[PDB]
């Protein structure tokens, strides 16, 4: 029982499309923030890589089709760039090709039995977007709301399964470091929380546009998908315990205390430490920015799902580290990792596979179970089809999941492995991989071909339980 999944549950994989497409300039796509990054600044990326190809899925999305047919996915969630909509962000010019593609990509799923899952932000803003300031600018939400009414209107009659955005704890950061995510803007500890708040607010508009305008013609689901690590005491004392929890709000509950809760806004741990260090640092105005209580009743319960991304686990320690000001020093931990764990090709990334059970509990506990649908979770390597890394990360953090819906009744509905195929890492160019499919980047056909790890997950998708070889 325990190995087997639930016969509702939904099994595939993901991608985002600027990790993907090709086709930065094509058939009328505007540029956008990760096109300005590549071209102007290739000193940030491994390489100078851009995603100017990529997996060329721009022209290539049958193959793409097809591999996942091969894997036998239920469900393909991709996401859908702004720029090539709309190319100048606004919704003045709708972009008549990139109506055209994604119309192509969902109705060649569905013709081979797979669902579509949309994420409608995964980091790629229009630039003339980020002229205006971008993210911190208050006026992306109803720029957001617009870009979602063209999307809902021209797919959603085929979608029913939506995500508004795509984990912004790591593109709020793109406002935290002069050489890092796009826009690669150095205001941490101010800017990046006004990133959070617009797209927090984005968000909330999203969700409402879709109840008044399109749920019930549509009749689907819109969610948002966050990224969390897990964050282990680093020794069992109230102290440690303490600054885990503290990483837990600072990092999930950022986003997820506004809208998942009964309560609404930030949490308070959050309001109250970084109104503390403001004070303390002279500055008149808290640096994090407030939610009126209409807004709050506003955002709150704009969900019908929660779409997690996850990764890795951290170790956690009382006390505080980091430059003044900035969002790490402000959450109040010391944050580690474990020689011990095994490693992967990314600095960041151990494979913890308990923490991804434990990750759901928190959740299940802290927001009354939600449904939860896993939209990422991957690892990577730096090449070779025969990926036994791959497969040993997949098949124990698909135990762990089975363990906590069937012994700890958390209420996960899908899983969409990351990713269906090498791609652009972002800042990370080419240099590692993440794909279950395997793309030569130096063949123009940029043909797909299946590693081990996709040949395992076929056989789980198949035969829908965990195989015996893999079990304890
Ligand atoms: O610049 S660093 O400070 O050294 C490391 C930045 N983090 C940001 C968070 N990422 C995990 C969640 O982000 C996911 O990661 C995947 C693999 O990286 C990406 O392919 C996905 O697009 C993304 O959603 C991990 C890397
Ligand atoms: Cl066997
Ligand atoms: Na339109």
């Not at 593109?171 to 006004?194: K, R």
Request: aromatic share 14%.
């Amino acid at each position: 029982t325990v190995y087997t999944f639930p016969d509702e549950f939904k099994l595939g994989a993901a991608t985002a499309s600027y990790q993907i497409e090709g086709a930065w300039d094509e058939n009328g796509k505007g540029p956008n923030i990760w096109d300005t990054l590549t071209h102007e600044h290739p000193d940030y990326v491994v390489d100078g890589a851009t995603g100017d190809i990529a997996d060329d899925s721009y022209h290539l999305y049958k193959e793409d089709v097809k591999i996942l047919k091969e894997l036998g996915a239920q469900v393909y969630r991709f996401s859908i760039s702004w720029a090539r909509v709309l190319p100048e962000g606004h919704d003045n010019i709708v972009n008549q090709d990139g109506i055209d593609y994604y119309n192509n990509l969902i109705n060649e799923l569905l013709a081979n039995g797979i669902e579509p899952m949309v994420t409608m932000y995964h980091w790629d803003l229009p630039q003339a977007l980020q002229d205006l300031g971008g993210w911190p600018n208050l006026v992306l939400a109803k720029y957001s709301e617009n870009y979602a009414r063209v999307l809902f209107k021209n797919f959603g009659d085929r979608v029913k399964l939506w995500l508004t955005f795509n984990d912004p704890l790591t593109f709020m950061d793109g406002y935290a470091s002069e050489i890092g995510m796009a826009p690669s803007i150095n205001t941490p500890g101010i800017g990046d929380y006004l990133a959070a708040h617009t797209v927090i607010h984005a968000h909330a508009r999203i969700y409402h546009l879709y109840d008044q305008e399109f749920r019930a013609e549509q009749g689907g689901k819109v969610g948002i998908s966050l990224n969390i690590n897990w964050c282990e005491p680093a020794t069992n004392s109230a102290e440690d315990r303490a600054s885990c929890e503290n990483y837990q709000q600072f990092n999930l509950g950022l986003y997820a205390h506004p809208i998942f809760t009964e309560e609404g806004d930030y949490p308070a741990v959050l309001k109250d430490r970084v109104s503390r260090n403001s004070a303390d640092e002279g500055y008149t105005d808290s640096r994090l920015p407030q939610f009126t209580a209409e807004e709050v009743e506003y955002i709150r319960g704009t969900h019908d799902f929660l779409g997690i991304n996850f990764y890795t686990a951290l170790l956690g320690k009382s006390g505080v580290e980091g430059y003044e000001p900035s969002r790490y020093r402000d959450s109040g931990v010391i944050l580690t990792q474990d020689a011990a764990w095994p490693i992967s090709a990314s600095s960041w990334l151990k494979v913890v596979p308990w923490g991804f059970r434990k990750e759901l509990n928190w959740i299940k506990n802290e927001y009354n179970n939600p449904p939860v649908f896993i939209t990422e979770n991957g690892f990577s390597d730096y090449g070779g089809l025969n990926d036994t890394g791959r497969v040993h990360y997949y098949t124990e953090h698909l135990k762990e999941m089975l363990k906590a819906i069937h012994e700890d009744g958390v209420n996960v509905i899908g899983y969409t492995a990351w990713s269906l195929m090498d791609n652009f890492e972002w800042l990370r160019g080419y240099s590692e991989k993440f794909g279950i499919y395997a793309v030569d980047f130096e063949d123009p056909a940029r043909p797909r071909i299946p590693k081990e790890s996709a040949k395992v997950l076929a056989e789980i998708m198949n035969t829908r339980k965990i195989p015996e070889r893999f079990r304890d």
